[PDB]
Amino acid sequence: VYKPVDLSKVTSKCGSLGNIHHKPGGGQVEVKSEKLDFKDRVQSKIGSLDNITHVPGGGNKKIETHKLT
Amino acid sequence: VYKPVDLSKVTSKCGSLGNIHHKPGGGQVEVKSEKLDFKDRVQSKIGSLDNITHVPGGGNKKIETHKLT
Amino acid sequence: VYKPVDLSKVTSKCGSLGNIHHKPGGGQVEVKSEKLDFKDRVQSKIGSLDNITHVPGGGNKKIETHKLT
Amino acid sequence: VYKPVDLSKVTSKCGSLGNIHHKPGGGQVEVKSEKLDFKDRVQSKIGSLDNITHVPGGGNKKIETHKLT
Amino acid sequence: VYKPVDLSKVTSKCGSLGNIHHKPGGGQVEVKSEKLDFKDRVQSKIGSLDNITHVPGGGNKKIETHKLT
Amino acid sequence: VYKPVDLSKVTSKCGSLGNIHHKPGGGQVEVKSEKLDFKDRVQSKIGSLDNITHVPGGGNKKIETHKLT
């Protein structure tokens, strides 16, 4: 018999949130390549890639798992 | 017998949210390539790629799993 | 016998949301190539690609899974 | 004898006038009432009311009063 | 005998006027009431009321008063 | 005999006027009341009330008064 009971609260009362500035890669990226030999797979990423700005008004994260075996 | 009970609250009261600025890759990317040999697959990404701005008014994330075996 | 019960709330009361600015790749991307050999598949992405702005008034995410075996 | 004089000038050279935002009550007003008793007159205002935006290109005032007895 | 004189200049050379934001009550107002008794007059104001945004390009104000008795 | 003379200049050369933000009540106002008794007049104000933004391009103010008796 398996009878867990949950009454949880996960909460936020953020009054105000703002003036957030993220300015990644604001300079120069200069790449010069000469006479290279590549004998296998190449991945190349140049510049400003995958940058995230993430500003949730809540962003509360409640994670749970149950098992029998 | 398996009877878990959940009465959970996952909540936010964000009063106000804003002035979020994300400026990825605002400078120069300069790539010069000469006399290169590639003998296998090439992936190349150049510039400002995959950048995210994500501003959910809640963004609360409630995740759960149950199993028997 | 399997009788899980969920009475959960996942909630947000965001009062106001705005002035979100996302400006990916606002500079120069310059790519110059000479005398290159490619002897297999090429993927090339140049410029401002895959950039996301995502501003949901809720954006709350409730996820659940059940299994028997 | 009473013979007062005024030759005054009231002036402005406001070159351009604009980009004015007035945004009252942009978020939730939530009033919840149960089992109240009122035994005399009620005046009740709920929401956004009586808010003023007033943007005259002049808006100067010249006000004067004279009296005898 | 009564012969006062005014030749005054009241002036402005305001080059440009703007980018004015007034945002009263962009948040939550939440009012919860139970089992109250009122035995005399009630005046109630809830939310965003009587807010003013006054932006005159002059707004210069010349005021005067004269009397005999 | 009554003969005052005024030659006054009241002036501004404000080059530009702006970027003004007034943001009262961007947060929570949360009011919870139970079982109160009021035996006389009630005046109640809740939220963002009476707020003034006042931005005259001149706003110069010349004020004068004269009397005999």
From Swiss-Prot, chains A, B, C, D, E, F:
Changing V29M: In FTD1; ultrastructural and biochemical characteristics indistinguishable from Alzheimer disease; accelerates aggregation of tau into filaments. The modification N6,N6-dimethyllysine is found at K3. Phosphorylation at serine and threonine residues in S-P or T-P motifs by proline-directed protein kinases (PDPK1, CDK1, CDK5, GSK3, MAPK) (only 2-3 sites per protein in interphase, seven-fold increase in mitosis, and in the form associated with paired helical filaments (PHF-tau)), and at serine residues in K-X-G-S motifs by MAP/microtubule affinity-regulating kinase (MARK1, MARK2, MARK3 or MARK4), causing detachment from microtubules, and their disassembly. Phosphorylation decreases with age. Polyubiquitinated. Requires functional TRAF6 and may provoke SQSTM1-dependent degradation by the proteasome. PHF-tau can be modified by three different forms of polyubiquitination. 'Lys-48'-linked polyubiquitination is the major form, 'Lys-6'-linked and 'Lys-11'-linked polyubiquitination also occur. There is a cross-link at K3, K9, K13, K23, K35, K39, K45, K61, K67 (Glycyl lysine isopeptide (Lys-Gly) (interchain with G-Cter in ubiquitin)). Expressed in neurons. Isoform PNS-tau is expressed in the peripheral nervous system while the others are expressed in the central nervous system. Tau/MAP repeats lie at residues 1-28, 29-60. The modification N6-acetyllysine is found at K3, K9, K13, K23, K35, K39, K61. The record marks K3, K9, K13, K23, K32, K35, K62, K67 as: Not glycated. The modification Phosphoserine is found at S16, S44, S48. It is found in: Cytoplasm, Cytosol; Cell membrane; Cytoplasm, Cytoskeleton; Cell projection, Axon. It is linked to In Alzheimer disease, the neuronal cytoskeleton in the brain is progressively disrupted and replaced by tangles of paired helical filaments (PHF) and straight filaments, mainly composed of hyperphosphorylated forms of TAU (PHF-TAU or AD P-TAU). O-GlcNAcylation is greatly reduced in Alzheimer disease brain cerebral cortex leading to an increase in TAU/MAPT phosphorylations. Frontotemporal dementia 1: A form of dementia characterized by pathologic finding of frontotemporal lobar degeneration, presenile dementia with behavioral changes, deterioration of cognitive capacities and loss of memory. In some cases, parkinsonian symptoms are prominent. Neuropathological changes include frontotemporal atrophy often associated with atrophy of the basal ganglia, substantia nigra, amygdala. In most cases, protein tau deposits are found in glial cells and/or neurons. Promotes microtubule assembly and stability, and might be involved in the establishment and maintenance of neuronal polarity. The C-terminus binds axonal microtubules while the N-terminus binds neural plasma membrane components, suggesting that tau functions as a linker protein between both. Axonal polarity is predetermined by TAU/MAPT localization (in the neuronal cell) in the domain of the cell body defined by the centrosome. The short isoforms allow plasticity of the cytoskeleton whereas the longer isoforms may preferentially play a role in its stabilization. Interacts with MARK1, MARK2, MARK3 and MARK4. Interacts with PSMC2 through SQSTM1. Interacts with SQSTM1 when polyubiquitinated. Interacts with FKBP4. Binds to CSNK1D. Interacts with SGK1. Interacts with PIN1. Interacts with LRRK2. Interacts with LRP1, leading to endocytosis; this interaction is reduced in the presence of LRPAP1/RAP. The tau/MAP repeat binds to tubulin. Type I isoforms contain 3 repeats while type II isoforms contain 4 repeats. This is Microtubule-associated protein tau. It comes from Homo sapiens. The gene is MAPT.
